[PDB]
Amino acid sequence: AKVETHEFTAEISQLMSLIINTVYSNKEIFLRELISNASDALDKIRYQALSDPSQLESEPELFIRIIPQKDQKVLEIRDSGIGMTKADLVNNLGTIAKSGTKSFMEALSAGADVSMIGQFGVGFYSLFLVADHVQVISKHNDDEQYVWESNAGGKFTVTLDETNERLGRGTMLRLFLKEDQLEYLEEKRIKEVVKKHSEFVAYPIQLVVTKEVEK
Numbered sequence: 001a002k003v004e005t006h007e008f009t010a011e012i013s014q015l016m017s018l019i020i021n022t023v024y025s026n027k028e029i030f031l032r033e034l035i036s037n038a039s040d041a042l043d044k045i046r047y048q049a050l051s052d053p054s055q056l057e058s059e060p061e062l063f064i065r066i067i068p069q070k071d072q073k074v075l076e077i078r079d080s081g082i083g084m085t086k087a088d089l090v091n092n093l094g095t096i097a098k099s100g101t102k103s104f105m106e107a108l109s110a111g112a113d114v115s116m117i118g119q120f121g122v123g124f125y126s127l128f129l130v131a132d133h134v135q136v137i138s139k140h141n142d143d144e145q146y147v148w149e150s151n152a153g154g155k156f157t158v159t160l161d162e163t164n165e166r167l168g169r170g171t172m173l174r175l176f177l178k179e180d181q182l183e184y185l186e187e188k189r190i191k192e193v194v195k196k197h198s199e200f201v202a203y204p205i206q207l208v209v210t211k212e213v214e215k
């Protein structure tokens, strides 16, 4: 019931420093990668639910939700997919992620762009193009809610979630944007990116916008 600190394998840590310092334009592709991961997670609970339709009871709705938090300079990406267990918060960044990270690093050395990260299965880490820090909140039907946190360094933490909204089921990525990357808190900006790169998504992409009620 405490804060469990871990170290990244050199491969994961290696990719994060590259992306976070990268001065590459076209930073906007991070959102395509995260939406694709959200859709994959929803595919899995929808598939699991096809036989046992009661795995959906923890959150009956299947959605992708984007929440700008302007005062916090935070952007949240939430899904009601299958979710990740505490085991996964420390054992979903390995195996498929161990291979995909190391081979992607070698492709980058050969000349590959960060736009290709997704075809190596590690598109998650493209968030560091725009964020210098991230928390990942997740809730799997067969486990409690947990929080994963990293600031692109070799160390990340995992903590039982006693402070965030209850997800019901699924995952929410909390991106702490950089000061030069705050454009991605704006409704018009998010619409453009989603419509350009995420046209073929089987689930509703909901955008939560906060607006002052005018005179």
Ligand SMILES: Nc1nc2sc(C(=O)NC3CCN(C[C@@](O)(Cn4cncn4)c4ccc(F)cc4F)CC3)cc2n(-c2ccc3c(c2)N(c2ccccc2)CCO3)c1=O
Residues within 6 Å of the ligand: 034, 037, 038, 041, 044, 079, 081, 082, 083, 084, 085, 087, 088, 089, 090, 092, 093, 097, 121, 122, 123, 124, 125, 136, 140, 142, 143, 148, 170, 171, 172
């Ligand atoms: N929004 C996101 N949502 C989802 S859901 C998800 C996922 O992989 N799997 C769930 C969990 C359980 N598994 C296995 C199984 O069923 C197998 N089993 C054992 N027994 C019987 N069956 C099972 C069941 C119950 C159980 F207790 C244990 C188990 F193993 C299948 C369904 C990944 C993501 N990612 C994501 C995508 C790509 C990524 C990452 C994150 N990275 C990441 C990872 C962690 C933290 C930070 C970043 C990094 C780079 O790449 C999202 O962004």
